[PDB]
Tab-separated table of C-alpha atoms and ligand atoms in Angstrom:
chain	number	residue	atom	x	y	z
A	1	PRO	CA	29.697	14.852	-78.957
A	2	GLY	CA	28.194	14.749	-75.454
A	3	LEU	CA	24.554	15.857	-74.317
A	4	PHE	CA	23.808	16.883	-71.110
A	5	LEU	CA	19.780	16.389	-69.776
A	6	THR	CA	18.320	16.838	-66.521
A	7	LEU	CA	14.887	15.452	-64.899
A	8	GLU	CA	13.432	17.871	-62.074
A	9	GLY	CA	9.822	17.794	-60.170
A	10	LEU	CA	8.612	16.871	-57.038
A	11	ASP	CA	9.002	13.476	-55.534
A	12	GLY	CA	6.362	11.167	-56.973
A	13	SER	CA	6.020	13.453	-60.266
A	14	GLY	CA	7.324	10.744	-62.561
A	15	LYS	CA	10.765	12.204	-62.701
A	16	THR	CA	12.774	9.049	-61.740
A	17	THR	CA	10.401	6.665	-64.069
A	18	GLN	CA	10.872	8.889	-67.030
A	19	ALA	CA	14.956	9.087	-66.451
A	20	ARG	CA	14.863	5.587	-66.659
A	21	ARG	CA	12.348	5.175	-69.635
A	22	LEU	CA	14.809	7.961	-71.555
A	23	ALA	CA	17.960	5.993	-70.819
A	24	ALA	CA	16.158	2.651	-71.686
A	25	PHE	CA	15.345	4.267	-74.594
A	26	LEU	CA	18.888	5.284	-75.904
A	27	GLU	CA	20.464	1.980	-74.824
A	28	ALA	CA	17.647	0.419	-77.137
A	29	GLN	CA	18.859	2.722	-79.931
A	30	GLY	CA	22.594	1.843	-79.289
A	31	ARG	CA	23.327	5.505	-78.210
A	32	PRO	CA	25.732	5.936	-75.198
A	33	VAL	CA	24.058	6.847	-72.160
A	34	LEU	CA	24.906	7.663	-68.452
A	35	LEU	CA	22.313	7.523	-65.963
A	36	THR	CA	22.869	9.388	-62.605
A	37	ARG	CA	21.336	11.367	-59.819
A	38	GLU	CA	21.343	14.161	-57.225
A	39	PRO	CA	22.207	13.700	-54.496
A	40	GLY	CA	24.720	11.051	-54.208
A	41	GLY	CA	26.109	10.910	-57.715
A	42	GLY	CA	29.422	13.198	-56.923
A	43	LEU	CA	29.860	12.088	-53.080
A	44	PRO	CA	27.776	8.924	-52.285
A	45	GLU	CA	28.204	9.412	-48.766
A	46	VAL	CA	26.434	12.748	-48.416
A	47	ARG	CA	23.235	11.211	-49.736
A	48	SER	CA	22.800	8.623	-46.691
A	49	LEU	CA	22.538	11.777	-44.465
A	50	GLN	CA	20.408	14.246	-41.002
A	51	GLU	CA	18.913	16.977	-38.964
A	52	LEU	CA	20.767	20.014	-40.799
A	53	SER	CA	20.117	23.854	-41.094
A	54	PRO	CA	19.056	24.157	-44.960
A	55	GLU	CA	22.246	26.613	-45.369
A	56	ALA	CA	24.228	23.332	-44.507
A	57	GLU	CA	22.210	20.773	-46.472
A	58	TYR	CA	22.817	23.400	-49.409
A	59	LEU	CA	26.309	23.447	-48.990
A	60	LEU	CA	26.807	19.735	-48.694
A	61	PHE	CA	24.699	19.275	-51.909
A	62	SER	CA	26.888	21.516	-53.492
A	63	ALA	CA	29.946	19.724	-52.656
A	64	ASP	CA	28.427	16.637	-53.776
A	65	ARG	CA	27.273	18.586	-57.045
A	66	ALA	CA	30.867	19.619	-57.634
A	67	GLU	CA	32.420	16.558	-57.626
A	68	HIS	CA	29.497	15.063	-59.602
A	69	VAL	CA	30.298	17.676	-62.142
A	70	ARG	CA	33.899	17.043	-62.323
A	71	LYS	CA	34.300	13.312	-61.928
A	72	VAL	CA	31.087	12.082	-63.447
A	73	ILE	CA	29.238	14.445	-65.434
A	74	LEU	CA	31.778	16.243	-67.703
A	75	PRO	CA	33.849	12.862	-68.417
A	76	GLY	CA	30.948	11.270	-69.343
A	77	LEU	CA	30.288	13.995	-71.631
A	78	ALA	CA	33.794	14.217	-73.040
A	79	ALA	CA	33.090	10.647	-74.048
A	80	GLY	CA	30.193	11.671	-76.412
A	81	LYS	CA	27.399	10.025	-73.859
A	82	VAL	CA	23.953	11.493	-73.000
A	83	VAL	CA	24.380	12.061	-69.287
A	84	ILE	CA	21.083	11.956	-67.792
A	85	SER	CA	20.578	13.623	-64.024
A	86	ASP	CA	17.888	12.750	-61.844
A	87	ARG	CA	18.119	16.317	-60.337
A	88	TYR	CA	20.523	18.829	-60.716
A	89	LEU	CA	20.995	22.545	-59.538
A	90	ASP	CA	17.374	23.362	-60.238
A	91	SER	CA	16.125	20.933	-57.541
A	92	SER	CA	18.530	22.993	-54.921
A	93	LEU	CA	16.964	26.460	-56.181
A	94	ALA	CA	13.288	25.043	-56.159
A	95	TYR	CA	13.549	23.188	-52.759
A	96	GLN	CA	16.287	25.368	-50.783
A	97	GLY	CA	15.345	28.744	-52.109
A	98	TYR	CA	11.780	29.111	-53.290
A	99	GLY	CA	10.861	26.151	-50.373
A	100	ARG	CA	12.893	26.987	-47.311
A	101	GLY	CA	13.301	30.751	-48.136
A	102	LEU	CA	17.196	30.416	-48.802
A	103	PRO	CA	18.305	33.720	-50.723
A	104	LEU	CA	18.557	32.760	-54.730
A	105	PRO	CA	21.638	34.966	-55.354
A	106	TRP	CA	23.536	33.348	-52.548
A	107	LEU	CA	22.368	30.025	-53.932
A	108	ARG	CA	23.400	30.965	-57.455
A	109	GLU	CA	26.630	32.443	-55.944
A	110	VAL	CA	27.550	29.211	-54.952
A	111	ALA	CA	26.929	27.354	-57.814
A	112	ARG	CA	28.688	29.159	-60.305
A	113	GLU	CA	31.943	27.619	-58.906
A	114	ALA	CA	30.382	24.264	-57.824
A	115	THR	CA	28.949	23.545	-61.296
A	116	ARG	CA	31.874	25.326	-63.367
A	117	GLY	CA	28.938	26.885	-65.320
A	118	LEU	CA	27.650	23.621	-66.750
A	119	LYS	CA	24.034	23.833	-67.467
A	120	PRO	CA	21.998	20.946	-69.116
A	121	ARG	CA	20.892	21.449	-72.741
A	122	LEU	CA	17.465	20.336	-72.216
A	123	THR	CA	15.484	19.929	-68.343
A	124	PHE	CA	12.583	17.885	-68.325
A	125	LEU	CA	10.229	19.357	-65.635
A	126	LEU	CA	7.221	16.717	-64.271
A	127	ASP	CA	5.002	19.052	-63.153
A	128	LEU	CA	1.960	18.381	-60.725
A	129	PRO	CA	0.254	19.720	-57.692
A	130	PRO	CA	1.594	18.505	-54.229
A	131	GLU	CA	-1.474	17.025	-53.745
A	132	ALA	CA	-0.872	14.499	-56.673
A	133	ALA	CA	2.477	13.889	-55.963
A	134	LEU	CA	2.208	12.768	-52.333
A	135	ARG	CA	-0.752	10.641	-53.305
A	136	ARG	CA	2.116	8.916	-55.652
A	137	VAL	CA	4.767	8.802	-52.994
A	138	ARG	CA	4.210	9.902	-49.278
A	139	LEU	CA	7.110	19.824	-43.928
A	140	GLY	CA	3.753	19.933	-45.426
A	141	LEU	CA	1.728	21.018	-48.134
A	142	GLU	CA	1.967	24.611	-48.443
A	143	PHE	CA	6.166	23.939	-48.877
A	144	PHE	CA	5.468	21.399	-51.364
A	145	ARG	CA	3.379	24.222	-53.305
A	146	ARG	CA	6.291	26.694	-53.023
A	147	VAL	CA	8.914	24.157	-54.425
A	148	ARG	CA	6.241	23.387	-57.334
A	149	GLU	CA	6.011	26.845	-57.988
A	150	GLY	CA	9.422	27.638	-57.674
A	151	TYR	CA	10.038	25.206	-60.752
A	152	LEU	CA	7.540	26.833	-62.595
A	153	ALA	CA	9.340	30.266	-62.110
A	154	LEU	CA	12.474	28.691	-63.170
A	155	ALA	CA	11.105	27.224	-66.349
A	156	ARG	CA	9.671	30.759	-66.837
A	157	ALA	CA	13.103	32.342	-66.785
A	158	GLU	CA	14.654	29.733	-68.937
A	159	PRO	CA	12.233	28.539	-71.379
A	160	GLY	CA	14.567	27.287	-74.141
A	161	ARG	CA	16.171	25.079	-71.335
A	162	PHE	CA	13.009	23.875	-69.456
A	163	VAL	CA	10.717	21.599	-70.924
A	164	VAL	CA	7.260	21.533	-69.158
A	165	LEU	CA	5.409	18.463	-68.966
A	166	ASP	CA	1.981	17.867	-67.491
A	167	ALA	CA	2.960	14.827	-64.998
A	168	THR	CA	-0.710	13.773	-64.677
A	169	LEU	CA	-0.508	12.377	-68.328
A	170	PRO	CA	-0.037	8.864	-68.822
A	171	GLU	CA	3.427	7.752	-68.588
A	172	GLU	CA	3.429	6.648	-72.337
A	173	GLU	CA	2.530	10.101	-73.581
A	174	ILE	CA	5.149	11.555	-71.209
A	175	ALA	CA	7.705	9.240	-72.570
A	176	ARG	CA	7.139	9.832	-76.279
A	177	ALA	CA	6.948	13.646	-75.776
A	178	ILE	CA	10.282	13.430	-74.291
A	179	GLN	CA	11.760	11.436	-77.072
A	180	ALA	CA	10.420	14.103	-79.707
A	181	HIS	CA	12.280	16.829	-77.830
A	182	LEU	CA	15.085	14.721	-77.954
A	183	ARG	CA	15.302	13.362	-81.340
A	184	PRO	CA	16.726	16.313	-83.204
A	185	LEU	CA	19.566	16.422	-80.591
A	186	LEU	CA	20.694	13.071	-81.633
A	187	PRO	CA	23.429	12.743	-84.435
B	1	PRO	CA	25.394	37.956	-24.716
B	2	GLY	CA	28.833	35.826	-24.797
B	3	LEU	CA	32.310	36.077	-26.764
B	4	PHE	CA	33.626	34.598	-29.567
B	5	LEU	CA	37.230	33.687	-29.884
B	6	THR	CA	39.167	31.869	-32.462
B	7	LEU	CA	42.709	30.256	-32.780
B	8	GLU	CA	44.453	30.039	-36.098
B	9	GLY	CA	47.595	28.678	-37.719
B	10	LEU	CA	49.630	25.956	-39.250
B	11	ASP	CA	49.493	22.736	-37.690
B	12	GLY	CA	52.172	22.401	-35.052
B	13	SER	CA	52.202	26.200	-34.370
B	14	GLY	CA	50.449	25.746	-31.058
B	15	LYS	CA	47.145	26.980	-31.652
B	16	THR	CA	45.411	23.682	-30.299
B	17	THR	CA	47.291	24.011	-27.383
B	18	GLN	CA	46.512	27.482	-26.556
B	19	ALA	CA	43.133	27.092	-27.110
B	20	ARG	CA	42.797	24.331	-24.540
B	21	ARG	CA	44.888	26.464	-22.139
B	22	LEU	CA	42.645	29.325	-22.645
B	23	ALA	CA	39.563	27.365	-21.953
B	24	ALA	CA	41.001	26.022	-18.697
B	25	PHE	CA	42.100	29.550	-17.504
B	26	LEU	CA	38.580	31.078	-18.178
B	27	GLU	CA	37.204	28.034	-16.639
B	28	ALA	CA	39.477	28.591	-13.343
B	29	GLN	CA	38.120	31.867	-13.323
B	30	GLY	CA	34.685	30.631	-13.053
B	31	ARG	CA	33.490	31.671	-16.616
B	32	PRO	CA	31.163	29.255	-18.776
B	33	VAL	CA	33.177	28.055	-21.893
B	34	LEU	CA	32.762	26.064	-24.914
B	35	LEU	CA	35.820	24.938	-26.555
B	36	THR	CA	34.807	23.837	-30.281
B	37	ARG	CA	36.820	23.327	-33.251
B	38	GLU	CA	36.753	23.037	-37.397
B	39	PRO	CA	36.600	20.907	-39.125
B	40	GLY	CA	34.047	18.781	-37.525
B	41	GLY	CA	32.322	21.080	-34.912
B	42	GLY	CA	29.077	21.229	-36.851
B	43	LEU	CA	29.197	17.877	-38.767
B	44	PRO	CA	31.392	15.449	-37.375
B	45	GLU	CA	31.318	13.183	-40.526
B	46	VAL	CA	32.713	15.821	-42.686
B	47	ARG	CA	36.410	14.623	-41.141
B	48	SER	CA	35.982	11.406	-42.973
B	49	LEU	CA	34.373	13.005	-46.185
B	50	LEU	CA	37.339	15.263	-46.301
B	51	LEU	CA	39.324	11.890	-46.772
B	52	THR	CA	37.907	11.250	-50.140
B	53	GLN	CA	40.652	10.708	-52.777
B	54	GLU	CA	41.262	13.735	-55.633
B	55	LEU	CA	38.543	15.639	-54.107
B	56	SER	CA	38.098	18.814	-55.931
B	57	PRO	CA	39.235	22.257	-54.095
B	58	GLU	CA	35.901	23.310	-54.717
B	59	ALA	CA	34.222	20.404	-52.942
B	60	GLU	CA	36.674	20.565	-50.058
B	61	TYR	CA	35.748	24.236	-49.442
B	62	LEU	CA	32.034	23.279	-49.667
B	63	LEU	CA	32.274	20.434	-47.112
B	64	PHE	CA	33.982	23.261	-44.680
B	65	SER	CA	31.297	25.499	-45.382
B	66	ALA	CA	28.552	23.162	-44.573
B	67	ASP	CA	30.442	22.099	-41.303
B	68	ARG	CA	30.892	25.719	-40.348
B	69	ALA	CA	27.154	26.714	-41.381
B	70	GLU	CA	25.763	23.762	-38.782
B	71	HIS	CA	28.745	25.098	-36.654
B	72	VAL	CA	27.309	28.338	-36.332
B	73	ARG	CA	23.754	27.578	-36.143
B	74	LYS	CA	23.812	24.458	-33.674
B	75	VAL	CA	26.964	25.238	-31.524
B	76	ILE	CA	28.591	28.683	-31.480
B	77	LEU	CA	25.382	31.033	-31.541
B	78	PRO	CA	23.370	29.121	-28.932
B	79	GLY	CA	26.557	29.164	-26.777
B	80	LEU	CA	26.734	32.688	-27.522
B	81	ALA	CA	23.229	33.553	-26.599
B	82	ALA	CA	23.747	31.325	-23.314
B	83	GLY	CA	26.559	33.979	-22.264
B	84	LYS	CA	29.571	31.483	-22.964
B	85	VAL	CA	32.930	32.404	-23.990
B	86	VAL	CA	32.989	30.044	-27.047
B	87	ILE	CA	36.465	29.395	-28.238
B	88	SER	CA	36.757	27.710	-31.823
B	89	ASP	CA	40.136	26.075	-32.737
B	90	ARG	CA	39.934	27.220	-36.943
B	91	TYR	CA	37.099	28.904	-38.140
B	92	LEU	CA	36.466	31.052	-41.503
B	93	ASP	CA	40.308	32.259	-41.704
B	94	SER	CA	41.490	28.733	-41.977
B	95	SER	CA	39.240	28.430	-45.231
B	96	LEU	CA	40.352	31.314	-46.808
B	97	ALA	CA	43.809	30.677	-46.141
B	98	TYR	CA	44.076	26.673	-46.980
B	99	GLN	CA	41.365	26.729	-49.597
B	100	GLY	CA	41.857	30.312	-50.927
B	101	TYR	CA	45.666	31.218	-50.654
B	102	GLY	CA	46.960	27.790	-50.355
B	103	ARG	CA	44.559	25.656	-53.079
B	104	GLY	CA	43.861	28.649	-55.256
B	105	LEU	CA	40.177	29.230	-54.863
B	106	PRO	CA	39.087	32.816	-55.702
B	107	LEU	CA	38.736	34.940	-52.457
B	108	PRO	CA	35.875	36.811	-53.671
B	109	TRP	CA	33.779	33.310	-54.163
B	110	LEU	CA	34.546	32.229	-50.799
B	111	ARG	CA	33.760	35.389	-49.095
B	112	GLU	CA	30.281	35.265	-50.868
B	113	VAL	CA	29.655	31.846	-49.841
B	114	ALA	CA	30.871	32.509	-46.557
B	115	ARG	CA	28.598	35.411	-45.709
B	116	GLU	CA	25.605	33.179	-45.489
B	117	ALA	CA	27.050	30.181	-44.232
B	118	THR	CA	28.361	32.026	-41.286
B	119	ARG	CA	25.479	34.132	-40.826
B	120	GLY	CA	27.811	37.257	-40.722
B	121	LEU	CA	29.405	35.952	-37.544
B	122	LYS	CA	32.706	37.029	-36.677
B	123	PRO	CA	34.899	36.442	-33.797
B	124	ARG	CA	35.634	39.180	-31.612
B	125	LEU	CA	39.622	38.226	-31.407
B	126	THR	CA	41.510	35.863	-33.457
B	127	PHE	CA	44.445	34.573	-32.287
B	128	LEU	CA	47.199	33.636	-35.026
B	129	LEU	CA	50.267	31.556	-34.150
B	130	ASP	CA	52.599	32.759	-36.636
B	131	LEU	CA	55.646	30.539	-37.687
B	132	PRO	CA	57.355	29.729	-40.853
B	133	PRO	CA	56.058	26.953	-42.570
B	134	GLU	CA	59.320	25.058	-42.287
B	135	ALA	CA	59.538	25.224	-38.681
B	136	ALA	CA	55.915	23.979	-38.224
B	137	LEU	CA	56.485	21.038	-40.239
B	138	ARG	CA	59.190	20.155	-38.345
B	139	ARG	CA	57.204	20.013	-35.441
B	140	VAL	CA	54.549	17.623	-36.273
B	141	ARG	CA	53.241	15.562	-39.507
B	142	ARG	CA	50.483	17.173	-41.511
B	143	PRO	CA	46.839	15.984	-41.335
B	144	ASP	CA	46.067	12.596	-43.420
B	145	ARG	CA	43.869	15.234	-45.653
B	146	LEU	CA	47.231	17.291	-46.526
B	147	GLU	CA	49.373	14.660	-47.393
B	148	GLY	CA	51.583	15.179	-50.173
B	149	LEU	CA	51.150	18.936	-50.487
B	150	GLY	CA	54.647	20.424	-50.397
B	151	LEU	CA	56.332	23.191	-48.788
B	152	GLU	CA	55.286	26.210	-51.149
B	153	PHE	CA	51.763	25.013	-50.197
B	154	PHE	CA	52.202	25.672	-46.929
B	155	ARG	CA	54.082	28.941	-47.529
B	156	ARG	CA	51.314	30.164	-49.305
B	157	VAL	CA	48.949	29.336	-46.122
B	158	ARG	CA	51.187	30.984	-44.009
B	159	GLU	CA	51.411	33.968	-46.040
B	160	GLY	CA	47.510	34.125	-46.617
B	161	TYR	CA	47.012	34.343	-42.924
B	162	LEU	CA	49.333	37.062	-42.595
B	163	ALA	CA	47.490	38.795	-45.417
B	164	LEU	CA	44.361	38.085	-43.240
B	165	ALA	CA	45.477	39.735	-40.508
B	166	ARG	CA	46.900	42.618	-42.182
B	167	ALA	CA	43.239	43.318	-43.687
B	168	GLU	CA	41.749	43.280	-40.021
B	169	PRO	CA	44.414	44.248	-37.320
B	170	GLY	CA	41.480	44.939	-34.858
B	171	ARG	CA	40.496	41.487	-34.899
B	172	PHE	CA	43.594	39.624	-35.388
B	173	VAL	CA	46.227	39.177	-32.730
B	174	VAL	CA	49.411	37.958	-34.345
B	175	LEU	CA	51.518	36.215	-31.994
B	176	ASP	CA	55.124	34.740	-32.504
B	177	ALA	CA	54.966	30.800	-32.518
B	178	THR	CA	58.579	30.670	-31.559
B	179	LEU	CA	58.252	32.247	-28.016
B	180	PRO	CA	58.192	30.084	-25.665
B	181	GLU	CA	54.688	28.283	-24.783
B	182	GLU	CA	54.194	30.307	-21.506
B	183	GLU	CA	54.503	33.802	-22.766
B	184	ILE	CA	52.369	32.893	-25.715
B	185	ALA	CA	49.613	32.012	-23.167
B	186	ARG	CA	50.373	35.207	-21.159
B	187	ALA	CA	50.105	37.500	-24.234
B	188	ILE	CA	46.736	35.802	-25.324
B	189	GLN	CA	45.356	36.028	-21.482
B	190	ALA	CA	46.615	39.704	-21.414
B	191	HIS	CA	44.738	40.603	-24.581
B	192	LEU	CA	41.765	38.881	-23.279
B	193	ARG	CA	41.760	40.426	-19.402
B	194	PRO	CA	39.906	43.888	-20.421
B	195	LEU	CA	37.076	41.667	-22.263
B	196	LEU	CA	36.861	39.289	-19.306
B	197	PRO	CA	36.469	41.491	-17.524
C	1	LIG	CA1	6.575	19.077	-60.006
C	2	LIG	CA1	9.025	8.288	-60.499
C	3	LIG	CA1	11.448	9.520	-70.678
C	4	LIG	CA1	18.091	20.495	-63.840
C	5	LIG	CA1	25.252	24.015	-55.958
C	6	LIG	CA1	48.598	22.540	-41.592
C	7	LIG	CA1	48.963	22.582	-30.625
C	8	LIG	CA1	46.115	30.176	-23.905
C	9	LIG	CA1	34.396	23.729	-40.897
C	10	LIG	CA1	39.423	32.518	-37.031
C	11	LIG	CL1	24.813	19.620	-73.675
C	12	LIG	CL1	9.820	10.875	-59.020
C	13	LIG	CL1	21.197	24.838	-64.563
C	14	LIG	CL1	16.697	29.649	-71.538
C	15	LIG	CL1	48.526	23.373	-33.472
C	16	LIG	CL1	47.473	28.930	-19.125
C	17	LIG	CL1	31.987	29.058	-45.056
C	18	LIG	CL1	35.727	35.912	-39.703
C	19	LIG	CL1	59.638	24.673	-34.906
C	20	LIG	CL1	39.670	44.822	-38.108
């Protein structure tokens, strides 16, 4: 049956590179795969959009996420695909919750119906310090620290789902680790 | 400072007319007014996004909510701090009536979401121009967003609005939208006189 996976981290963590490495690996094995991303995977018009309150930003991204789940991810899963999302709800929680200081219970209330309760089977978190991530792809430092630390809090709360990787390791070692975590899940 | 007023009802009820007439009346009395509306007062592009084919009711609500959240923070609250009478043609009640009662989204979820989205801001008074849905639907076409919903949808909306008004009778002023336009304007203005003064 289908398998829902996500990739998470700061921009410049290697999250996107790894998403593509994992899709390409599944394609090479002949395993049906759907690579997608947030924001934009549900309502592309939300993505290109742009001076908002973080409450409005979160709601807009939730609307996108609601369509993404219903129109893209769930159908992919019903088809038996490995659906890989570059960013999902954890991004909003980390950035809007821990970063901007929006209340986590509200964020989660909104999410319950936006996602219809859909959670990924595994989430690969490319963890590194903001300074390293900024070097790699160019608000400020203290904000990105709160985001980084929020992701780690999420990972501690849901240790079965999160796979925390040192995003400073060589790409290839990371890719191989991700493949190793996936291998037993693939029929 | 300031005074927050809203108008609500089915399209064709006359709430748009009345909001405009009320603004012009208060302007004639020398009062600063901000006449605004939803959807679009916060994020004008939500109007376009609302015309996505087969949009889930959840996403439609969240779109309205994003618009409202920005509406409140960038338009309504600044206007109120500036002493203005801010009049919105549609606010939270429209979401509750249309996406809740009409489309069937769970009301407690809508309320949970709205509590932060709106920053807890409620209008001082809300003028609900009530009439039967069949009567509304003869007056004017439905917005593009709502093309291909039937009478029973609009009945559930009409009835939702009345339910909201029963629960908050101090905020809602329910008016018969089948009275003459001048009588409705008179009534709205009479409700407002003791406040403005
Ligand atoms: Ca990270
Ligand atoms: Ca990358
Ligand atoms: Ca990978
Ligand atoms: Ca995730
Ligand atoms: Ca969400
Ligand atoms: Ca209508
Ligand atoms: Ca009107
Ligand atoms: Ca009036
Ligand atoms: Ca709105
Ligand atoms: Ca209202
Ligand atoms: Cl899954
Ligand atoms: Cl990245
Ligand atoms: Cl999740
Ligand atoms: Cl877990
Ligand atoms: Cl109207
Ligand atoms: Cl008048
Ligand atoms: Cl709302
Ligand atoms: Cl309200
Ligand atoms: Cl009529
Ligand atoms: Cl009340």
